[PDB]
């Protein structure tokens, strides 16, 4: 590995190597069916909103959302690098695609398929990823960069559907040796969203624009129709002509075909026919390759960047709504724009790479921080882009001031901005991104007093329910299969409108959304003021018992939506004490004398009231009427976590939160597997994990890095540390599961899983505040 000098991957980097098996991986452990895609992952391409496109470690691209909502794992085997290498002198040069496998059935047959093991090298630290590839019967060395511009503050690039793959070749060697490097891509209109005859009409064509010192030579893949639906749209991919490099390309050959039409002239020389044909096709596959080649001396290192883009500027759910895409305001509608947004990256790559750099920096610079929890807090914002993510501009039909988004839940429970899971889950948007925050969060405000009387039936019992009832904040903002942002509550198994964190959520990410972009947006805390106070009054009617505290009903009613809470509970008593101190923090903001004056009755009540009903002398017990009411639940003191941030100050005694954090420390985290898988929701005073419910033998991948903020807060910075690296260590170590790029929700003590790809652990980034 001479490549690694001449590029500069940082140390914290995931690294796996190329066509490694992973012999450990986890599977789902729920009864019904669960995705699982494999631990053949990697970094995704491709901006927020815009679809992703995952290319794994072995190097193809498999994991497709670019049907927004949706997860589909195929490997598109004619999307591939390759290379050629003749070594000047011999005979003969040899030719191989990049890719650890080979296609299933015996299209592409003539290709050179299974890259070798212990050849290369894949790493990743989001959004940059990388490949390196030490072959000894490669004499030149290769590596490539490939990311897409997603930088924070940022909203603009950060929405493209783009990708570079900036290319470094190094000889080594004391010979001149004669290199190309081709990208081959399908022309995937029709890949989805197209009913019958997939790939009817798609034609290629090439584009060459030479404006002085930058040639471009381009394939735009394309379809006949100028019709404007979610399959229609481009690809392209293309490369920059850099000095001491010529091109060369071929615009049409058949993908359900056996390859030669392409691979006879790349294996011969490196060097393609640079036929143009924009034959549209009718039931044959068609793809298109864009191919560079050039001499390295000895001791030569050379640079060249290619591209990908994707203009598929409609998304269409299942309830029948089509939107444009974000990145529509800066290429336009139409789906006839692939050849400019490609433009753009080839033109500017360099530039993002060093506002990449520039947002990374901060964080890799700091030598106090461990390489892993760098790992990890970089490669967990993939979910940012990967989590099925929509933002809008613009209705098909339909011009508005603001642009919607949401971020899935996850795809087995496919729910737009599960709002007591974006409690833990939006941290990087409000950090990084918070105009898409706040967006999301007067999204909710506007659904506060919506009543929808119409009802449906809940999944847990089979009692029929009131679907969105007014004053009640709801549980998400639709479903992908459904209709976002338009039909709210598309979750079905509790009853949301009954549930005892939601409201409480609400305000406490009111708060902190105006504390962490730096206390200066009281037109956001006007905005929301109004649903702030009706959501606390509907809650505090939820108090049967006039302790001043909302009851949990014997049912669950909170996000651990298995796992029954009855009376007061520490996790939703604590949650509603630090809404209502955020509430009256509002009040007196606002000048709003009646609602301080209000809001600070109810917390000293509460509070008194919560610290009798639950303080047992060593930690908070789980609730007062259960019958394990004395477990010791990891997510105990969420409303202080959340008062720490929000710096609202002490809602339970110093000493008090110090014990119980101590408490959680020594028995779910290091009585569960040695304190090396994170901390389990639930465990009995004698040290047992409780089993009451599955959720309370889970660990929660997004409450153990919310609990690890919370202990560093205090000073336990031992504690939050180790307690974080078990989540680490399961996800991205040799020793864990196999869960990187696609981090669950939650483990069992076996470590299988429920619910990869989640939104939960995206909390990491409450580590950074
Ligand atoms: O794993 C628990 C989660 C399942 N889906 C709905 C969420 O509200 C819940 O927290
Ligand atoms: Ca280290
Ligand atoms: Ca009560």
């Given at each position: 590995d001479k490549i690694s000098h001449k590029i500069d991957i940082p140390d914290s980097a995931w690294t796996i190597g190329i066509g490694e098996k992973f012999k450990n991986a986890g599977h789902p452990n729920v009864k019904y069916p669960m995705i699982d895609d494999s631990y053949v992952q990697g970094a995704p391409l491709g901006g927020f909103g815009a679809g992703t496109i995952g290319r794994t470690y072995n190097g193809g691209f498999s994991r497709w959302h670019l049907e927004i909502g949706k997860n589909k794992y195929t490997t598109v085997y004619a999307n591939q690098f390759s290379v050629f290498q003749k070594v000047e002198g011999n005979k003969d040069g040899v030719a191989q695609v990049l890719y650890a496998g080979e296609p299933e059935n015996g299209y592409l047959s003539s290709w050179k398929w299974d890259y070798p093991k212990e050849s290369g090298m894949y790493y990743a630290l989001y959004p940059n990823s990388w490949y390196t590839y030490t072959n000894k019967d490669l004499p030149v060395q290769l590596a490539v960069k490939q990311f897409s511009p997603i930088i924070p503050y940022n909203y603009k690039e950060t929405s493209y559907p783009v990708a570079v793959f900036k290319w470094t070749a190094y000889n080594p060697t004391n010979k001149n040796?004669?290199?190309?490097?081709?990208?081959?891509?399908?022309?995937?209109?029709?890949?989805?969203?197209?009913?019958?005859?997939?790939?009817?009409?798609?034609?290629?064509?090439?584009?060459k624009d030479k404006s002085k010192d930058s040639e471009i030579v381009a394939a735009v893949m394309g379809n006949i129709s100028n019709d404007n639906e979610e399959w229609n749209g481009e690809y392209s991919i293309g490369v920059k002509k850099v000095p001491g490099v010529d091109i060369s390309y071929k615009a049409k050959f058949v993908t359900t075909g056996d390859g030669s039409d392409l691979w006879h002239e790349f294996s011969k020389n490196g060097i393609l026919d640079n036929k143009d044909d924009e034959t549209p096709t009718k039931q044959d596959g068609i793809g298109s390759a864009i191919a560079v080649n050039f001499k390295l001396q000895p001791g030569q290192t050379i640079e060249v960047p290619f591209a990908l883009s994707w203009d598929l500027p409609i998304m269409?759910?299942?309830?029948?709504?089509?939107?444009?895409?974000?990145?529509?305001?800066?290429?336009?509608?139409?789906?006839?724009?692939?050849?400019?947004?490609?433009?753009?990256?080839?033109?500017?790559?360099?530039?993002?790479?060093?506002?990449?750099?520039?947002?990374?920096?901060?964080?890799?610079?700091?030598?106090?921080?461990?390489?892993?929890?760098?790992?990890?807090?970089?490669?967990?914002?993939?979910?940012?882009?990967?989590?099925?993510?929509?933002?809008?501009?613009?209705?098909?039909?339909?011009?508005?001031?603001?642009?919607?988004?949401?971020?899935?839940?996850?795809?087995?429970?496919?729910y737009y901005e599960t709002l007591d899971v974006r409690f833990y889950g939006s941290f990087p948007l409000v950090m990084l991104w918070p105009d898409i925050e706040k967006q999301v969060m007067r999204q909710f405000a506007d659904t506060i007093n919506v009543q929808d009387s119409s009802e449906f039936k809940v999944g847990s019992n089979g009692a029929m329910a009131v679907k969105k009832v007014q004053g009640m904040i709801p549980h998400d903002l639709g479903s992908s299969?459904?209709?976002?942002?338009?039909?709210?509550?598309?979750?079905?198994?509790?009853?949301?409108?009954?549930?005892?964190?939601?409201?409480?959520?609400?305000?406490?990410?009111?708060?902190?959304?105006?504390?962490?972009?730096?206390?200066?947006?009281?037109?956001?805390?006007?905005?929301?003021?109004?649903?702030?106070?009706?959501?606390?009054?509907?809650?505090?009617?939820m108090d049967k018992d006039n302790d001043g505290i909302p009851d949990n009903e014997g049912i669950p009613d909170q996000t651990y939506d298995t796992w029954s809470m009855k009376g007061t509970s520490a996790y939703c008593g604590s949650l509603w004490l630090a809404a209502l101190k955020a509430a009256q923090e509002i009040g007196k903001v606002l000048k709003d004398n009646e609602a301080y004056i209000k809001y600070n009755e109810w917390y000293k009540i509460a509070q008194q009231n919560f610290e009798k009903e639950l303080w047992n002398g060593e930690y908070y017990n789980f609730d007062t009427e259960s019958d394990h009411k004395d477990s010791i639940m990891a997510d105990q003191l969420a409303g202080q976590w959340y008062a720490d941030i929000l710096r609202l100050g002490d809602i339970l005694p110093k000493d008090h939160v110090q014990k119980a954090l101590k408490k959680i420390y020594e028995?779910?985290?290091?009585?569960?597997?040695?304190?090396?898988?994170?901390?389990?929701?639930?465990?009995?005073?004698?040290?047992?994990?409780?089993?009451?419910?599955?959720?309370?033998?889970?660990?929660?991948?997004?409450?153990?890095?919310?609990?690890?903020?919370?202990?560093?807060?205090?000073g336990m910075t031992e504690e939050a540390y180790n307690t974080a690296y078990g989540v680490y260590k399961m996800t991205y170590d040799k020793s864990g599961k196999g869960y990187w790029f696609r981090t669950p929700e939650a483990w069992t003590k076996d470590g299988n899983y429920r619910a990869s790809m989640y939104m939960r652990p995206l909390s990491i980034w409450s580590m950074e505040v």
């Open positions: 040796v004669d290199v190309s490097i081709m990208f081959t891509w399908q022309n995937m209109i029709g890949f989805f969203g197209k009913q019958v005859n997939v790939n009817s009409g798609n034609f290629n064509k090439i584009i269409k759910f299942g309830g029948g709504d089509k939107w444009y895409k974000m990145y529509t305001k800066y290429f336009g509608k139409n789906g006839k724009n692939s050849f400019a947004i490609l433009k753009e990256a080839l033109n500017n790559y360099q530039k993002w790479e060093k506002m990449i750099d520039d947002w990374q920096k901060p964080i890799l610079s700091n030598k106090s921080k461990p390489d892993w929890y760098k790992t990890a807090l970089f490669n967990e914002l993939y979910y940012l882009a990967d989590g099925g993510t929509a933002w809008e501009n613009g209705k098909v039909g339909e011009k508005r001031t603001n642009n919607m988004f949401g971020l899935l839940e996850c795809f087995d429970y496919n299969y459904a209709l976002p942002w338009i039909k709210i509550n598309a979750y079905d198994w509790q009853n949301p409108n009954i549930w005892k964190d939601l409201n409480s959520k609400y305000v406490l990410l009111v708060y902190r959304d105006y504390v962490l972009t730096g206390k200066t947006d009281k037109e956001f805390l006007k905005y929301t003021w109004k649903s702030v106070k009706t959501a606390l009054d509907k809650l505090k009617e028995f779910n985290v290091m009585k569960f597997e040695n304190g090396k898988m994170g901390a389990v929701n639930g465990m009995r005073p004698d040290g047992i994990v409780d089993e009451s419910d599955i959720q309370a033998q889970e660990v929660w991948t997004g409450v153990t890095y919310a609990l690890a903020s919370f202990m560093k807060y205090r």
